[PDB]
Amino acid sequence: TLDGPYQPTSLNLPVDYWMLIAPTREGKVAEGTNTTDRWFACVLVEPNVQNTQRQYVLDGQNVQLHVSNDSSTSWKFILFIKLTPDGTYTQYSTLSTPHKLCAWMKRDNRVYWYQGATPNASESYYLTINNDNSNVSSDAEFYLIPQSQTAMCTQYINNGL
């Protein structure tokens, strides 16, 4: 079930809900943290982007990041992670898709996202201890999908809404 859409915002997301984010333009898509040892950032890159540095607002300040997208047809979401409050975001995972949809979810002890190349992208996860101060921000409209209906989230990620 597609709950939404919702306008951009920041909150402590309840566990077991995919945030399916649907941006229209390249740029920062989302960020999230448990405030202790994980800071996540997702950016969207348009097709045919040669190695370059782009500036994004992350964790409250401007940050320069290396990006590229070798595809002529798919857009590319890139997940960056830093593991300390004053560390350095580094590229961790990518999703290549012509549909410009990405998703993430919090569960007990994990954060999930989709990775690979549509239409055969699949879920990946990272050990993350959730807390009462955890928070996530979406810069684009998004939907919520219950974890019980993960198959439908996968359907949308790979094949479009």
Short mmCIF file of all heavy atoms in Angstrom, two decimals, residues 16-70:
data_model
loop_
_atom_site.label_atom_id
_atom_site.label_comp_id
_atom_site.label_asym_id
_atom_site.label_seq_id
_atom_site.Cartn_x
_atom_site.Cartn_y
_atom_site.Cartn_z
N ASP A 16 10.17 -0.14 10.37
CA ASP A 16 9.40 -1.00 9.45
C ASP A 16 8.53 -0.28 8.42
O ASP A 16 7.45 -0.77 8.07
CB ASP A 16 8.59 -2.04 10.25
CG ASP A 16 9.46 -2.91 11.12
OD1 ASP A 16 10.66 -3.06 10.82
OD2 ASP A 16 8.97 -3.43 12.14
N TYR A 17 8.99 0.87 7.95
CA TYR A 17 8.34 1.61 6.87
C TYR A 17 9.40 2.04 5.87
O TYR A 17 10.35 2.74 6.24
CB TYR A 17 7.62 2.85 7.41
CG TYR A 17 6.34 2.48 8.11
CD1 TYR A 17 6.29 2.33 9.49
CD2 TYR A 17 5.18 2.22 7.38
CE1 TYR A 17 5.11 1.96 10.14
CE2 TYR A 17 4.00 1.86 8.00
CZ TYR A 17 3.97 1.73 9.38
OH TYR A 17 2.80 1.36 10.01
N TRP A 18 9.26 1.61 4.62
CA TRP A 18 10.10 2.13 3.56
C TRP A 18 9.68 3.54 3.27
O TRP A 18 8.48 3.81 3.14
CB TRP A 18 9.93 1.32 2.26
CG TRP A 18 10.52 -0.06 2.31
CD1 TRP A 18 9.85 -1.23 2.55
CD2 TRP A 18 11.90 -0.41 2.09
NE1 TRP A 18 10.74 -2.30 2.49
CE2 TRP A 18 12.00 -1.82 2.21
CE3 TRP A 18 13.06 0.33 1.82
CZ2 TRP A 18 13.21 -2.51 2.06
CZ3 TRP A 18 14.27 -0.35 1.66
CH2 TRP A 18 14.34 -1.76 1.79
N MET A 19 10.66 4.44 3.19
CA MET A 19 10.47 5.76 2.59
C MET A 19 10.85 5.63 1.13
O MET A 19 12.03 5.46 0.79
CB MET A 19 11.38 6.83 3.22
CG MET A 19 10.96 7.36 4.56
SD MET A 19 12.23 8.51 5.11
CE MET A 19 11.76 10.00 4.23
N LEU A 20 9.85 5.68 0.25
CA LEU A 20 10.11 5.61 -1.18
C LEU A 20 10.13 7.03 -1.73
O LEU A 20 9.10 7.69 -1.77
CB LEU A 20 9.02 4.78 -1.88
CG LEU A 20 9.08 4.64 -3.41
CD1 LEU A 20 10.30 3.82 -3.81
CD2 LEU A 20 7.79 3.96 -3.89
N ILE A 21 11.32 7.50 -2.10
CA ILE A 21 11.55 8.91 -2.40
C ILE A 21 11.60 9.13 -3.90
O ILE A 21 12.25 8.39 -4.62
CB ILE A 21 12.85 9.43 -1.71
CG1 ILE A 21 12.84 9.03 -0.23
CG2 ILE A 21 12.94 10.94 -1.86
CD1 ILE A 21 14.15 9.23 0.51
N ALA A 22 10.89 10.16 -4.38
CA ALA A 22 10.63 10.35 -5.80
C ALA A 22 11.03 11.76 -6.25
O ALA A 22 10.15 12.60 -6.53
CB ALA A 22 9.16 10.09 -6.11
N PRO A 23 12.35 12.03 -6.33
CA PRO A 23 12.81 13.34 -6.78
C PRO A 23 12.60 13.53 -8.30
O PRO A 23 12.45 12.54 -9.04
CB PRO A 23 14.30 13.32 -6.47
CG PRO A 23 14.69 11.88 -6.43
CD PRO A 23 13.47 11.10 -6.06
N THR A 24 12.60 14.79 -8.74
CA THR A 24 12.52 15.09 -10.17
C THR A 24 13.87 15.55 -10.74
O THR A 24 14.11 15.46 -11.96
CB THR A 24 11.43 16.15 -10.49
OG1 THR A 24 11.77 17.39 -9.85
CG2 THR A 24 10.04 15.69 -10.02
N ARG A 25 14.75 16.05 -9.88
CA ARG A 25 15.99 16.71 -10.32
C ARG A 25 17.20 16.16 -9.57
O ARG A 25 17.07 15.69 -8.43
CB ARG A 25 15.93 18.23 -10.06
CG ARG A 25 14.76 18.99 -10.68
CD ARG A 25 14.71 20.41 -10.11
NE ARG A 25 13.82 21.29 -10.86
CZ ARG A 25 12.51 21.44 -10.63
NH1 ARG A 25 11.91 20.75 -9.67
NH2 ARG A 25 11.80 22.28 -11.38
N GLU A 26 18.37 16.24 -10.20
CA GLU A 26 19.63 15.86 -9.55
C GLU A 26 19.89 16.71 -8.30
O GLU A 26 19.39 17.85 -8.18
CB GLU A 26 20.81 15.99 -10.55
CG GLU A 26 21.05 17.41 -11.09
CD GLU A 26 20.22 17.76 -12.34
OE1 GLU A 26 19.17 17.12 -12.63
OE2 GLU A 26 20.63 18.71 -13.04
N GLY A 27 20.63 16.15 -7.36
CA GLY A 27 20.98 16.85 -6.13
C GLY A 27 20.81 15.99 -4.89
O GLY A 27 20.56 14.78 -4.99
N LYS A 28 20.93 16.62 -3.73
CA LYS A 28 20.75 15.89 -2.47
C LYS A 28 19.33 15.37 -2.35
O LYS A 28 18.36 16.12 -2.59
CB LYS A 28 21.09 16.76 -1.26
CG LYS A 28 20.81 16.01 0.05
CD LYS A 28 21.26 16.75 1.29
CE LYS A 28 20.20 17.71 1.78
NZ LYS A 28 20.62 18.23 3.12
N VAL A 29 19.21 14.11 -1.97
CA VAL A 29 17.90 13.45 -1.88
C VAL A 29 17.46 13.29 -0.42
O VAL A 29 16.32 13.63 -0.06
CB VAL A 29 17.89 12.09 -2.59
CG1 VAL A 29 16.54 11.41 -2.45
CG2 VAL A 29 18.24 12.27 -4.07
N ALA A 30 18.37 12.80 0.42
CA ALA A 30 18.01 12.48 1.80
C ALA A 30 19.25 12.39 2.68
O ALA A 30 20.36 12.17 2.18
CB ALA A 30 17.27 11.15 1.86
N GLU A 31 19.03 12.53 3.98
CA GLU A 31 20.07 12.21 4.93
C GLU A 31 19.47 11.61 6.20
O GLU A 31 18.27 11.74 6.47
CB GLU A 31 21.02 13.39 5.17
CG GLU A 31 20.44 14.60 5.86
CD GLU A 31 21.45 15.73 5.88
OE1 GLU A 31 22.54 15.52 6.46
OE2 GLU A 31 21.17 16.79 5.30
N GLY A 32 20.29 10.88 6.94
CA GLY A 32 19.79 10.24 8.15
C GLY A 32 20.91 9.97 9.14
O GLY A 32 22.06 9.89 8.75
N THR A 33 20.56 9.81 10.41
CA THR A 33 21.57 9.53 11.44
C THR A 33 20.95 8.87 12.67
O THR A 33 19.75 9.05 12.96
CB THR A 33 22.32 10.81 11.88
OG1 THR A 33 23.41 10.46 12.76
CG2 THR A 33 21.38 11.77 12.64
N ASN A 34 21.79 8.11 13.39
CA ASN A 34 21.42 7.69 14.74
C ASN A 34 22.08 8.58 15.82
O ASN A 34 21.92 8.32 17.00
CB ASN A 34 21.73 6.19 14.95
CG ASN A 34 23.23 5.88 15.02
OD1 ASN A 34 24.07 6.74 14.75
ND2 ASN A 34 23.57 4.64 15.36
N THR A 35 22.80 9.62 15.37
CA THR A 35 23.49 10.63 16.23
C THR A 35 24.73 10.13 16.97
O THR A 35 25.39 10.92 17.68
CB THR A 35 22.58 11.35 17.27
OG1 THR A 35 22.38 10.51 18.42
CG2 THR A 35 21.22 11.76 16.65
N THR A 36 25.06 8.85 16.82
CA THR A 36 26.18 8.24 17.55
C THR A 36 27.29 7.75 16.62
O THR A 36 28.45 8.17 16.77
CB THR A 36 25.71 7.10 18.48
OG1 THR A 36 25.12 6.05 17.71
CG2 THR A 36 24.69 7.62 19.49
N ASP A 37 26.96 6.86 15.68
CA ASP A 37 28.01 6.26 14.84
C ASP A 37 27.62 5.95 13.40
O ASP A 37 28.32 5.22 12.72
CB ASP A 37 28.65 5.02 15.53
CG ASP A 37 27.62 4.00 15.98
OD1 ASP A 37 26.52 3.95 15.36
OD2 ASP A 37 27.90 3.25 16.95
N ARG A 38 26.50 6.52 12.93
CA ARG A 38 26.13 6.45 11.50
C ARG A 38 25.50 7.76 11.05
O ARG A 38 24.55 8.25 11.67
CB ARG A 38 25.15 5.32 11.18
CG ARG A 38 25.78 3.94 11.01
CD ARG A 38 25.64 3.18 12.32
NE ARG A 38 26.12 1.81 12.17
CZ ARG A 38 27.40 1.44 12.28
NH1 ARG A 38 28.34 2.36 12.53
NH2 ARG A 38 27.72 0.15 12.16
N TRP A 39 26.06 8.30 9.97
CA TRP A 39 25.47 9.41 9.23
C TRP A 39 25.39 8.99 7.78
O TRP A 39 26.42 8.64 7.17
CB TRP A 39 26.31 10.69 9.39
CG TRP A 39 26.13 11.35 10.71
CD1 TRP A 39 25.35 12.45 10.99
CD2 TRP A 39 26.74 10.97 11.96
NE1 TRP A 39 25.45 12.78 12.34
CE2 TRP A 39 26.29 11.88 12.95
CE3 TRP A 39 27.65 9.96 12.34
CZ2 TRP A 39 26.69 11.80 14.29
CZ3 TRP A 39 28.04 9.86 13.69
CH2 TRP A 39 27.55 10.77 14.64
N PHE A 40 24.17 8.98 7.23
CA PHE A 40 23.94 8.55 5.85
C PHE A 40 23.55 9.75 4.99
O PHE A 40 22.87 10.65 5.46
CB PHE A 40 22.78 7.55 5.80
CG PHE A 40 22.96 6.32 6.66
CD1 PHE A 40 22.42 6.26 7.95
CD2 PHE A 40 23.61 5.20 6.16
CE1 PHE A 40 22.56 5.11 8.73
CE2 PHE A 40 23.77 4.04 6.94
CZ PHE A 40 23.23 4.01 8.22
N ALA A 41 23.97 9.74 3.73
CA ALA A 41 23.58 10.77 2.76
C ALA A 41 23.31 10.13 1.41
O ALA A 41 24.09 9.28 0.96
CB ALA A 41 24.66 11.83 2.63
N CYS A 42 22.21 10.52 0.77
CA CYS A 42 21.91 10.03 -0.56
C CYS A 42 21.80 11.20 -1.53
O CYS A 42 21.08 12.16 -1.26
CB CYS A 42 20.62 9.23 -0.56
SG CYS A 42 20.10 8.71 -2.22
N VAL A 43 22.54 11.12 -2.63
CA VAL A 43 22.46 12.12 -3.69
C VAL A 43 22.06 11.46 -5.00
O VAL A 43 22.35 10.29 -5.23
CB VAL A 43 23.77 12.93 -3.86
CG1 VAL A 43 24.22 13.51 -2.52
CG2 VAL A 43 24.87 12.10 -4.51
N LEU A 44 21.39 12.24 -5.85
CA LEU A 44 20.99 11.78 -7.17
C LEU A 44 21.83 12.46 -8.25
O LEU A 44 21.97 13.70 -8.25
CB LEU A 44 19.50 12.06 -7.40
CG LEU A 44 18.94 11.63 -8.76
CD1 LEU A 44 19.07 10.12 -8.95
CD2 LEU A 44 17.48 12.10 -8.90
N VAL A 45 22.38 11.65 -9.16
CA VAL A 45 23.20 12.13 -10.29
C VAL A 45 22.51 11.75 -11.63
O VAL A 45 22.15 10.58 -11.85
CB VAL A 45 24.64 11.55 -10.23
CG1 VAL A 45 25.54 12.13 -11.31
CG2 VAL A 45 25.28 11.81 -8.88
N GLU A 46 22.37 12.75 -12.51
CA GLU A 46 21.79 12.56 -13.85
C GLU A 46 22.72 11.70 -14.74
O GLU A 46 23.89 11.45 -14.37
CB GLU A 46 21.50 13.93 -14.50
CG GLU A 46 22.73 14.65 -15.07
CD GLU A 46 23.45 15.51 -14.05
OE1 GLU A 46 23.30 15.28 -12.83
OE2 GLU A 46 24.19 16.43 -14.47
N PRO A 47 22.22 11.23 -15.90
CA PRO A 47 23.06 10.40 -16.80
C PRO A 47 24.27 11.15 -17.37
O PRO A 47 24.26 12.38 -17.43
CB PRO A 47 22.08 10.01 -17.91
CG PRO A 47 20.73 10.04 -17.25
CD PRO A 47 20.82 11.27 -16.38
N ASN A 48 25.32 10.41 -17.74
CA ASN A 48 26.50 10.96 -18.43
C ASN A 48 27.22 12.05 -17.63
O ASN A 48 27.36 13.19 -18.10
CB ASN A 48 26.11 11.52 -19.82
CG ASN A 48 25.84 10.44 -20.85
OD1 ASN A 48 24.78 10.42 -21.50
ND2 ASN A 48 26.81 9.54 -21.03
N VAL A 49 27.67 11.70 -16.43
CA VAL A 49 28.38 12.66 -15.60
C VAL A 49 29.79 12.09 -15.38
O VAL A 49 29.99 11.08 -14.75
CB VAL A 49 27.69 12.96 -14.25
CG1 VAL A 49 28.61 13.80 -13.40
CG2 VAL A 49 26.40 13.69 -14.47
N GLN A 50 30.76 12.78 -15.93
CA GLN A 50 32.15 12.38 -15.79
C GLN A 50 32.61 12.73 -14.41
O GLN A 50 32.03 13.55 -13.81
CB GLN A 50 33.00 13.14 -16.78
CG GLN A 50 33.00 12.51 -18.15
CD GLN A 50 33.88 13.25 -19.14
OE1 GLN A 50 35.03 13.54 -18.88
NE2 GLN A 50 33.31 13.55 -20.30
N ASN A 51 33.68 12.11 -13.95
CA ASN A 51 34.24 12.37 -12.65
C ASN A 51 34.25 13.81 -12.33
O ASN A 51 34.77 14.59 -13.04
CB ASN A 51 35.68 11.87 -12.55
CG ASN A 51 35.77 10.38 -12.51
OD1 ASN A 51 34.96 9.73 -11.95
ND2 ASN A 51 36.78 9.84 -13.12
N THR A 52 33.62 14.14 -11.24
CA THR A 52 33.55 15.53 -10.84
C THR A 52 33.29 15.68 -9.34
O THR A 52 32.91 14.73 -8.66
CB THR A 52 32.46 16.28 -11.66
OG1 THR A 52 32.64 17.69 -11.49
CG2 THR A 52 31.06 15.88 -11.21
N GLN A 53 33.52 16.89 -8.84
CA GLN A 53 33.20 17.24 -7.46
C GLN A 53 31.94 18.11 -7.43
O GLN A 53 31.83 19.08 -8.18
CB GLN A 53 34.36 18.02 -6.81
CG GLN A 53 35.70 17.30 -6.80
CD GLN A 53 35.84 16.29 -5.67
OE1 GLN A 53 35.47 16.57 -4.54
NE2 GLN A 53 36.36 15.11 -5.99
N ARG A 54 30.99 17.76 -6.57
CA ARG A 54 29.79 18.56 -6.38
C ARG A 54 29.61 18.89 -4.91
O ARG A 54 30.00 18.11 -4.05
CB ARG A 54 28.55 17.84 -6.94
CG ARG A 54 28.47 17.92 -8.46
CD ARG A 54 27.25 17.19 -9.06
NE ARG A 54 27.28 17.29 -10.52
CZ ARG A 54 26.37 16.79 -11.36
NH1 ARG A 54 25.31 16.12 -10.91
NH2 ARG A 54 26.53 16.95 -12.67
N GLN A 55 29.01 20.05 -4.63
CA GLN A 55 28.82 20.48 -3.25
C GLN A 55 27.37 20.22 -2.82
O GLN A 55 26.42 20.48 -3.58
CB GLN A 55 29.24 21.96 -3.07
CG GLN A 55 30.75 22.16 -3.22
CD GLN A 55 31.26 23.49 -2.64
OE1 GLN A 55 30.49 24.42 -2.38
NE2 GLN A 55 32.58 23.57 -2.44
N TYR A 56 27.23 19.64 -1.65
CA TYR A 56 25.91 19.31 -1.09
C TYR A 56 25.87 19.78 0.35
O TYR A 56 26.88 19.76 1.06
CB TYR A 56 25.63 17.80 -1.14
CG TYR A 56 25.75 17.18 -2.53
CD1 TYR A 56 26.98 16.67 -2.98
CD2 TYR A 56 24.64 17.11 -3.39
CE1 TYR A 56 27.10 16.11 -4.25
CE2 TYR A 56 24.75 16.56 -4.66
CZ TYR A 56 25.99 16.05 -5.08
OH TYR A 56 26.11 15.50 -6.34
N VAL A 57 24.68 20.14 0.81
CA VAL A 57 24.51 20.45 2.21
C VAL A 57 24.28 19.16 2.99
O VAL A 57 23.25 18.51 2.82
CB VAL A 57 23.32 21.39 2.44
CG1 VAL A 57 23.12 21.60 3.93
CG2 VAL A 57 23.56 22.72 1.73
N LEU A 58 25.23 18.81 3.86
CA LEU A 58 25.12 17.59 4.65
C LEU A 58 25.49 17.87 6.11
O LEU A 58 26.50 18.51 6.38
CB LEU A 58 26.04 16.50 4.09
CG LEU A 58 25.70 15.98 2.68
CD1 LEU A 58 26.79 15.01 2.27
CD2 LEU A 58 24.33 15.31 2.66
N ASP A 59 24.66 17.37 7.03
CA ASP A 59 24.89 17.55 8.47
C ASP A 59 25.11 19.02 8.81
O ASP A 59 25.90 19.34 9.70
CB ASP A 59 26.11 16.71 8.92
CG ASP A 59 26.08 16.38 10.41
OD1 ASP A 59 25.04 16.58 11.10
OD2 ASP A 59 27.14 15.94 10.91
N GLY A 60 24.43 19.89 8.08
CA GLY A 60 24.32 21.29 8.44
C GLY A 60 25.33 22.21 7.77
O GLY A 60 25.30 23.41 8.01
N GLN A 61 26.20 21.64 6.94
CA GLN A 61 27.25 22.43 6.27
C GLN A 61 27.53 21.97 4.85
O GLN A 61 27.19 20.84 4.46
CB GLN A 61 28.54 22.38 7.09
CG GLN A 61 29.12 20.98 7.25
CD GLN A 61 30.22 20.93 8.29
OE1 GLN A 61 31.37 20.65 7.98
NE2 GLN A 61 29.87 21.23 9.54
N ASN A 62 28.16 22.85 4.06
CA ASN A 62 28.50 22.49 2.68
C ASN A 62 29.63 21.46 2.66
O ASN A 62 30.62 21.59 3.37
CB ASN A 62 28.88 23.74 1.87
CG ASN A 62 28.12 23.85 0.55
OD1 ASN A 62 27.56 22.87 0.05
ND2 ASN A 62 28.10 25.05 -0.02
N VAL A 63 29.47 20.43 1.84
CA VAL A 63 30.42 19.34 1.75
C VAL A 63 30.66 19.03 0.28
O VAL A 63 29.70 18.86 -0.49
CB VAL A 63 29.90 18.05 2.44
CG1 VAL A 63 30.93 16.94 2.34
CG2 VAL A 63 29.53 18.31 3.91
N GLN A 64 31.93 18.95 -0.11
CA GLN A 64 32.28 18.58 -1.47
C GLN A 64 32.42 17.07 -1.58
O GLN A 64 33.13 16.44 -0.79
CB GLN A 64 33.60 19.25 -1.84
CG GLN A 64 33.94 19.26 -3.30
CD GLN A 64 35.25 20.00 -3.51
OE1 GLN A 64 35.34 21.21 -3.24
NE2 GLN A 64 36.28 19.28 -3.94
N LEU A 65 31.74 16.48 -2.56
CA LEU A 65 31.78 15.02 -2.76
C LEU A 65 32.15 14.69 -4.20
O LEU A 65 31.70 15.36 -5.13
CB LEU A 65 30.40 14.38 -2.43
CG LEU A 65 29.85 14.44 -1.00
CD1 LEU A 65 28.49 13.74 -0.91
CD2 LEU A 65 30.83 13.83 0.01
N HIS A 66 32.93 13.62 -4.39
CA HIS A 66 33.18 13.07 -5.73
C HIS A 66 31.97 12.29 -6.21
O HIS A 66 31.48 11.44 -5.50
CB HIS A 66 34.38 12.10 -5.74
CG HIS A 66 34.48 11.31 -7.02
ND1 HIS A 66 34.95 11.85 -8.19
CD2 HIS A 66 34.13 10.03 -7.30
CE1 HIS A 66 34.90 10.94 -9.15
NE2 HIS A 66 34.39 9.83 -8.64
N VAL A 67 31.51 12.57 -7.43
CA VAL A 67 30.44 11.77 -8.05
C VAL A 67 30.77 11.48 -9.53
O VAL A 67 31.58 12.18 -10.15
CB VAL A 67 29.04 12.47 -7.95
CG1 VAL A 67 28.63 12.68 -6.50
CG2 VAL A 67 29.04 13.82 -8.66
N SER A 68 30.12 10.46 -10.08
CA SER A 68 30.14 10.20 -11.52
C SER A 68 28.96 9.30 -11.87
O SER A 68 28.38 8.65 -10.98
CB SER A 68 31.46 9.53 -11.94
OG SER A 68 31.53 8.22 -11.43
N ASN A 69 28.58 9.28 -13.14
CA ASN A 69 27.56 8.34 -13.63
C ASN A 69 27.88 7.99 -15.08
O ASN A 69 27.65 8.82 -15.97
CB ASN A 69 26.16 8.94 -13.49
CG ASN A 69 25.06 7.98 -13.96
OD1 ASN A 69 25.31 6.81 -14.27
ND2 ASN A 69 23.82 8.47 -14.00
N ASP A 70 28.42 6.79 -15.29
CA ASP A 70 28.82 6.32 -16.62
C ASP A 70 27.64 5.96 -17.53
O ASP A 70 27.83 5.77 -18.73
CB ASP A 70 29.75 5.10 -16.54
CG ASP A 70 31.09 5.41 -15.88
OD1 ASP A 70 31.45 6.60 -15.72
OD2 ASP A 70 31.81 4.45 -15.51
#
